[PDB]
Amino acid sequence: MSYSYDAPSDFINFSSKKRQWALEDFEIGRPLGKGKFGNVYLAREKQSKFILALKVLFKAQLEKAGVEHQLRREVEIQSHLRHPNILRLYGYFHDATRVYLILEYAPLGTVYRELQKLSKFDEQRTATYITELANALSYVHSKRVIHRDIKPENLLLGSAGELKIADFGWSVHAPSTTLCGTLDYLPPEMIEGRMHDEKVDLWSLGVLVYEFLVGKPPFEANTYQETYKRISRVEFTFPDFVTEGARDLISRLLKHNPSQRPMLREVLEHPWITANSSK
Amino acid sequence: MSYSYDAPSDFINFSSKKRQWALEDFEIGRPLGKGKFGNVYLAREKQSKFILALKVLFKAQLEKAGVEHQLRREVEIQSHLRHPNILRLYGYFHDATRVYLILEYAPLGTVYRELQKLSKFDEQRTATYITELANALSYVHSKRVIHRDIKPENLLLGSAGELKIADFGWSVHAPSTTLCGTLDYLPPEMIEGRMHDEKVDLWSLGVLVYEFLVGKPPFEANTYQETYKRISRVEFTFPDFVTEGARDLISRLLKHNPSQRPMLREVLEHPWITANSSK
Numbered sequence: 001m002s003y004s005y006d007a008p009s010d011f012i013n014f015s016s017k018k019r020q021w022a023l024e025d026f027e028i029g030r031p032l033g034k035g036k037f038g039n040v041y042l043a044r045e046k047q048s049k050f051i052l053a054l055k056v057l058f059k060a061q062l063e064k065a066g067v068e069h070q071l072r073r074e075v076e077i078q079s080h081l082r083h084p085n086i087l088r089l090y091g092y093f094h095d096a097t098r099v100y101l102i103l104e105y106a107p108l109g110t111v112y113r114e115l116q117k118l119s120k121f122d123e124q125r126t127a128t129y130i131t132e133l134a135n136a137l138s139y140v141h142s143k144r145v146i147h148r149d150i151k152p153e154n155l156l157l158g159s160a161g162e163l164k165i166a167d168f169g170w171s172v173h174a175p176s177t178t179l180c181g182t183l184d185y186l187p188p189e190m191i192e193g194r195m196h197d198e199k200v201d202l203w204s205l206g207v208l209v210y211e212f213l214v215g216k217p218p219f220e221a222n223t224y225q226e227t228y229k230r231i232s233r234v235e236f237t238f239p240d241f242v243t244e245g246a247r248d249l250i251s252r253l254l255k256h257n258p259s260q261r262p263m264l265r266e267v268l269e270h271p272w273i274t275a276n277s278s279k
Numbered sequence: 280m281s282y283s284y285d286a287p288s289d290f291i292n293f294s295s296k297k298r299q300w301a302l303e304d305f306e307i308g309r310p311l312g313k314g315k316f317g318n319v320y321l322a323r324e325k326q327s328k329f330i331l332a333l334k335v336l337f338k339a340q341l342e343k344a345g346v347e348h349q350l351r352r353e354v355e356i357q358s359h360l361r362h363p364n365i366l367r368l369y370g371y372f373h374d375a376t377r378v379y380l381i382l383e384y385a386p387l388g389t390v391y392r393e394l395q396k397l398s399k400f401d402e403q404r405t406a407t408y409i410t411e412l413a414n415a416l417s418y419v420h421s422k423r424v425i426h427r428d429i430k431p432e433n434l435l436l437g438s439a440g441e442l443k444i445a446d447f448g449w450s451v452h453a454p455s456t457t458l459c460g461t462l463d464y465l466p467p468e469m470i471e472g473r474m475h476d477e478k479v480d481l482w483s484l485g486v487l488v489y490e491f492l493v494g495k496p497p498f499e500a501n502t503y504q505e506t507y508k509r510i511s512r513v514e515f516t517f518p519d520f521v522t523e524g525a526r527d528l529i530s531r532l533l534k535h536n537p538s539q540r541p542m543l544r545e546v547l548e549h550p551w552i553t554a555n556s557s558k
């Protein structure tokens with residue numbers, strides 16, 4: 001009847017090798033870009049002469065904004081993703097005042113910029129991009145990666161013109177009051193959709209196919225209320241130059257019923273995709 | 280067999296009383312606040328000596344940002360809502376360079392500011408706020424108003440300390456590239472939830488009850504990924520000072536299954552609400 005066990009009852013405080021990277025390992029070249037917290041430069045590892053991109057963030061600016069924990073999580077997540085169509089994060093290091101991300105270098109810029117210059121893409125460039133993105137999305141889902149919308153701004157281009165999913169916009173919607181609002185008031189049914197199964201990403205893929213081929217998203221409007229209504233009622237139309245095969249794929253991806261959207265493997269098998277994709 | 284009907288076949292171009300407001304109708308007092316596009320002043324209508332708030336926007340800044348159509352829609356929607364717990368928009372007028380909104384004046388500031396000063400609210404202030412918000416939400420749903428999250432920042436306080444839902448943050452997420460990202464890639468199942476039925480707003484109401492009584496939202500975390508997980512798995516706990524009646528209401532509003540959340544009329548009937556609400 002004794003309750004003095006041979007087991008712990010003490011209070012527990014739950015709040016508790018090789019050559020490392022160094023800044024002197026890299027030659028520095030021209031700046032490749034700049035965000036709110038990051039400064040990206042062309043760089044080269046000295047021993048191997050290997051070209052990469054070095055992103056420099058300042059610890060003072062990260063802590064003053066309260067986004068250091070978010071940056072840490074992004075570095076931990078991205079550095080474990082290895083896929084030819086996901087921008088590789090080789091590693092990181094830090095000194096007194098700065099954090100350094102050692103990144104794969106994407107020489108041909110973003111798809112957003114390329115879409116601005118060409119206005120719209122032809123069926124072969126589009127179908128090849130979709131094959132690469134479908135492959136990347138399959139890898140992302142198998143790793144259960146929590147991610148945001150894949151838009152042209154989030155897509156870099158490799159040396160051979162292949163897609164590279166980038167982690168841009170990580171600081172936006174990150175808990176710091178945040179300017180864009182957080183998720184604190186959103187119910188599960190509005191946030192679980194992505195990650196749970198493929199159907200949300202398949203819809204977003206359909207929007208991206210349309211934007212690639214047309215140059216603008218299918219549901220754009222002048223107000224947030226009208227865009228809301230067009231999406232929910234699936235009110236969109238095709239220009240004349242969109243072919244029947246493209247229409248078939250986009251219309252099946254943009255089904256209101258998520259169960260009616262074709263799986264990622266069905267997208268890679270679509271006759272319009274296989275006919276026009278070089279991948 | 281003739282197909283020349285007595286009916287129109289011509290191409291149609293679908294792209295086509297009393298005393299009005301004037302700036303001289305108002306005496307101007309001290310500024311009440313300032314946003315990105317708006318400048319709010321204490322004002323008084325001259326004939327009646329009636330105190331109100333006059334919000335001044337500049338047409339050049341609206342058009343340069345491409346949010347004029349969104350402002351127009353907000354003015355059209357808000358000016359048709361008449362509820363004691365929704366900030367009244369009496370009307371509007373414009374001159375050469377400025378747009379003017381004639382608004383109900385809320386003397387006691389925002390609930391966000393009041394929550395900062397008190398750290399947390401007692402059960403009587405909280406239960407009364409919830410009664411007012413439930414009533415406002417019922418009116419909003421009956422009018423099928425497309426709205427965003429009701430947060431303390433979106434809530435003003437009237438002269439008697441009653442809640443006033445304000446239309447703050449309208450320019451954010453409005454199609455202009457927008458800094459916070461638009462809805463163009465979101466599927467219906469992620470956007471229909473609010474407006475369709477009450478269940479999304481009931482969840483958000485539960486979060487608000489918790490934040491009122493505790494001072495912080497129940498699912499806050501240092502990363503967006505962890506907040507995601509806590510919401511979807513409904514991982515939150517109560518401090519010691521939250522009473523059983525409050526726990527019962529919050530836990531029923533924060534059900535993962537939307538059909539298990541009590542209706543707005545059930546919230547107004549909850550024994551904890553009726554015992555502590557003065558409304």
Ligand SMILES: Nc1ncnc2c1ncn2[C@@H]1O[C@H](COP(=O)(O)OP(=O)(O)NP(=O)(O)O)[C@@H](O)[C@H]1O
Pocket residue numbers: 032033034035036037038039040053055087103104105106107110156167168169170171
């Ligand atoms: N690996 C890369 N190769 C080529 N260009 C890059 C690379 N990484 C970034 N850039 C460019 O540099 C810009 C800024 O990158 P980045 O700093 O990562 O943006 P961000 O993460 O969205 N915001 P922030 O982290 O605050 O700087 C990008 O928009 C690209 O134009």
Ligand SMILES: Nc1ncnc2c1ncn2[C@@H]1O[C@H](COP(=O)(O)OP(=O)(O)NP(=O)(O)O)[C@@H](O)[C@H]1O
Pocket residue numbers: 311312313314315316317318319332334366382383384385386389435446447448449450
């Ligand atoms: N009717 C009002 N009575 C009292 N204070 C008000 C009123 N309207 C606005 N304010 C205050 O003025 C601030 C700015 O209001 P407002 O300009 O409407 O913000 P906003 O709509 O979210 N952004 P913007 O429209 O670009 O200015 C608010 O945050 C309040 O503190």
Ligand SMILES: OC[C@H]1O[C@H](O[C@H]2O[C@H](CO)[C@@H](O)[C@H](O)[C@H]2O)[C@H](O)[C@@H](O)[C@@H]1O
Pocket residue numbers: 124125126128160161162278
């Ligand atoms: O023909 C237009 C396409 O040109 C590029 O792709 C070609 O060049 C690459 C580099 O040699 C090859 O890997 C690829 O197989 C070629 O098709 C571009 O990347 C594509 O977007 C264009 O559709």
Ligand SMILES: OC[C@H]1O[C@H](O[C@H]2O[C@H](CO)[C@@H](O)[C@H](O)[C@H]2O)[C@H](O)[C@@H](O)[C@@H]1O
Pocket residue numbers: 403404405407439440441557
């Ligand atoms: O007792 C605390 C409450 O004080 C305010 O409400 C009181 O004052 C109002 C103005 O006379 C009355 O309308 C109201 O009935 C009173 O309860 C305040 O508005 C509440 O938030 C406080 O809980």
